[PDB]
Nucleic acid binder design. Structure first.
Ligand SMILES: [Zn+2]
Lengths: 136, 67, 25, 213, 101
RNA sequence: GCGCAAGACGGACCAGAGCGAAAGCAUUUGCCAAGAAUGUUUUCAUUAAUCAAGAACGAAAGUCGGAGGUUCGAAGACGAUCAGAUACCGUCGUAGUUCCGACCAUAAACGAUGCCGACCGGCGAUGCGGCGGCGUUAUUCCCAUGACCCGCCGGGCAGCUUCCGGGAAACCAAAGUCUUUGGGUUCCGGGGGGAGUAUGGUUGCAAAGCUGAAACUUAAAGGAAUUUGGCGAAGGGCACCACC
């Protein structure tokens, strides 16, 4: 439940999977292997209102929650894995991922590699909607 | 929240345009007399003359244009 | 109209007329 | 009801003598509880490490796959599993008004390990170039692809993994590609996309022991 | 009235091209007809670049970018105001606008 | 995060680029067959152009019979919308969508322009083959080729400008060479509705395809463009009878 390595000599590393869509955000933190995790949090964990799921506020509250959990457990540094909606839907990251990164960096933890693990396809199946699309 | 911010001062240099839906906030670029190398962009409501001094609560956050 | 739905209604009328013609036999 | 973090260990991972930096971080596991084995739970853990985190200040847009096999207590030993490229780098290669040459091969080393290598190629826009397009003919692209495939099926089977991945570190296979392909059409940017491990033989402890040391 | 010299696309010697899908909607548009934006962007736009610079173990760490292209139907492009309309006499200007920043 | 299985598709490279009679065509590799252009002091010597009847191919949807059905999604089911929506929206979802056969021959199948031949401007570019001409590179010597530069030829997708000329004008290097009217030749239109309708023949298991009137009614229906207009179109300015 603690890191036996001294903090001054070395710092420990985990990774985080910042998945942000147009209606939700996730902050999921695990180690380099990624098989087992530290803690998880969604965009609806800290706000009961559904309308406020896609916002900077739920992202920064989630980042503060995992910040407190990683401070109390003993994980000091984190690698970045940003994720958009992915697949064939949307290749653009959500408007809460940057605020989540800002909240997770302003709380005094060290960062590592910043890499996009957005699931880009070669060619997927047909997109949702009609031939004329989602018109409104 | 457990967040404490130090008191920050300001010093206006050159006037700029005005933002807001009704033009009540005025852009102005400032310098810090405490550390004369950092300059940030902020909005001020009220009359502003060049050569005046502004009071703040924190100087680490910037504001957007409209929304 | 637009000619697509006018043609569709005319073809439905043709099918109705052919139904009545084959029923009248 | 109770925190599972009380039933939690802290093991270390080590690189073989094939690499330079030995340890890279920590892992998390519980102790054994009868039908649960702590040695099994450390088996299927693929790692995602950078090249500059394993060597000195070299290029840092390459990723290496490391898979664990065996533990002895408070420490673990890994092995090579594959190669990856940074998506920032790979997405920065592809620009308009040049042709892409991509190849693959199924080539087997001296031992039972089998690799599927990839290559990608982007052509020279010349120093004295005025013409916008600078494309290549299809037979030229075909024979450059044949040249890349025959080079990377020349390099691999003559040795084993312990030295061909040492060749795979700086640029050497891509160096051979970019040095043996000026004759057909000049090309400027070739690296190795990925190495996808396909088949592994029965596991012996001795080979894992001699790589680590 | 023939509005343009071409017909809103670059189809001059084929007759049929491959259709693709938009991003804001799913409208099937031909590839040479659509308005495509190959946008270039960074991970941190303008806010936390100093935050990333100070709080990094790697000294003077270079920030990565993100590469993405979007496909637009004409209604979705004008609704997003990417492209606007002008006079027919000034419609014959194929040059892109001068990018300053 | 690791393995397994299924079907669909070949992103980025991907273009006012290429090929094909047209529909249409994109992972790599192998096999079979075909073709334009180019080069030619090779061959036959008018074998040619357009073409009723007849014939081949033919987007999507549709029908019959097997296999497969990942995703999508007509019919239909459920909640919110508005005065009302069995519409838009979201979750599901049958038939189809995929492959092998068997069929109708219908698209804004459009460059809304049939083919062959000849003539009359300029300019910069791109693709193919051939031909030259300072120079750089696969290291230096050195030739042949690939790569790059500067010119040419012939054909093709195209582009900019033009008081040649034309047109109702948009615009056209063809829609030009037309009262100064004739190069050769297939299809097709005579105000708008009725109406691509009735009937008859024809083809098809069927959806329907081809051929196709009349009675009656009507003085307008149409194409190009200027001038104010009306935008829940974009882009500027002003007003305490607009506001902070
Ligand atoms: Zn769209």
């Amino acid at each position: 439940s603690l890191g036996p390595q001294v903090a001054e000599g070395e710092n420990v590393f985990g990774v985080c999977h910042i998945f942000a869509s147009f209606n939700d955000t996730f902050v999921h933190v695990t180690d380099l292997s990624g098989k087992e995790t530290i803690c998880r949090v969604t965009g609806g964990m800290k706000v009961k209102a559904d309308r406020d799921e896609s916002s900077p506020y739920a992202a920064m509250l989630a980042a503060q929650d995992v910040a407190q959990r990683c401070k109390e457990l003993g994980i000091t540094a984190l690698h970045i894995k940003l994720r958009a909606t992915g697949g064939n839907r949307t290749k653009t990251p959500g408007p809460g991922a940057q605020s989540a990164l800002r909240a997770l960096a302003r709380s005094g933890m060290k960062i590592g590699r910043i890499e996009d693990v957005t699931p880009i396809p070669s060619d997927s199946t047909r997109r949702k909607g009609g031939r004329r699309g989602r018109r409104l | 929240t457990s967040r404490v911010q130090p008191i920050k001062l300001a010093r206006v240099t050159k006037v700029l345009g005005r933002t807001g839906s009704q033009g009540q906030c005025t852009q102005v670029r400032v310098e810090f007399m405490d550390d004369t190398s950092r300059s940030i962009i902020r909005n001020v409501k009220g009359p502003v003359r060049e050569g005046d001094v502004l009071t703040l609560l924190e100087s680490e956050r910037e504001a957007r244009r409209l929304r | 109209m637009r000619a697509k739905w006018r043609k569709k209604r005319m073809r439905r009328l043709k099918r109705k007329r052919r139904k009545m013609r084959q029923r009248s036999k | 009801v109770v925190d599972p973090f009380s039933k939690k260990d802290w093991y270390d991972v080590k690189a073989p003598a094939m690499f330079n930096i030995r340890n890279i971080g920590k892992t998390l596991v519980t102790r054994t509880q009868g039908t649960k084995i702590a040695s099994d739970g450390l088996k299927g853990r693929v790692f995602e490490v950078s090249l500059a985190d394993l060597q000195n200040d070299e290029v840092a847009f390459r990723k290496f796959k490391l898979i664990t096999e065996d533990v002895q207590g408070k420490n673990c030993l890994t092995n090579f599993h594959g190669m990856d490229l940074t998506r920032d780098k790979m997405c920065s290669m592809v620009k308009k008004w040049q042709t892409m040459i991509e190849a693959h091969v199924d080539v087997k080393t001296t031992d039972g390990y089998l690799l599927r290598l990839f290559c990608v190629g982007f052509t020279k826009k010349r120093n004295n170039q005025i013409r916008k397009t600078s494309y290549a003919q299809h037979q030229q692209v075909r024979q450059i692809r044949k040249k890349m495939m025959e080079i990377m099926t020349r390099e691999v089977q003559t040795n084993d993994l312990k030295e061909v991945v040492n060749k795979l570190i700086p640029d050497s296979i891509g160096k051979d590609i970019e040095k043996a392909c000026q004759s057909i059409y000049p090309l400027h940017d070739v690296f190795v996309r990925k190495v996808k491990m396909l088949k592994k033989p029965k596991f012996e402890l001795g080979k894992l022991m001699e790589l680590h040391g | 009235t023939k509005k343009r010299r071409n017909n809103g696309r670059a189809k001059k010697g084929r007759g049929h091209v491959q259709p693709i899908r938009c991003t804001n909607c799913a409208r099937c548009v031909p590839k040479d007809k659509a308005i495509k934006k190959f946008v270039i962007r960074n991970i941190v736009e303008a806010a936390a670049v100093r935050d990333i610079s100070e709080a990094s173990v790697f000294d003077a760490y270079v920030l990565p970018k993100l590469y993405v292209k979007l496909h637009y139907c004409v209604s979705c492009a004008i609704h997003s105001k990417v492209v606007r309309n002008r006079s027919r006499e000034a419609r014959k200007d194929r040059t892109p606008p001068p990018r300053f920043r």
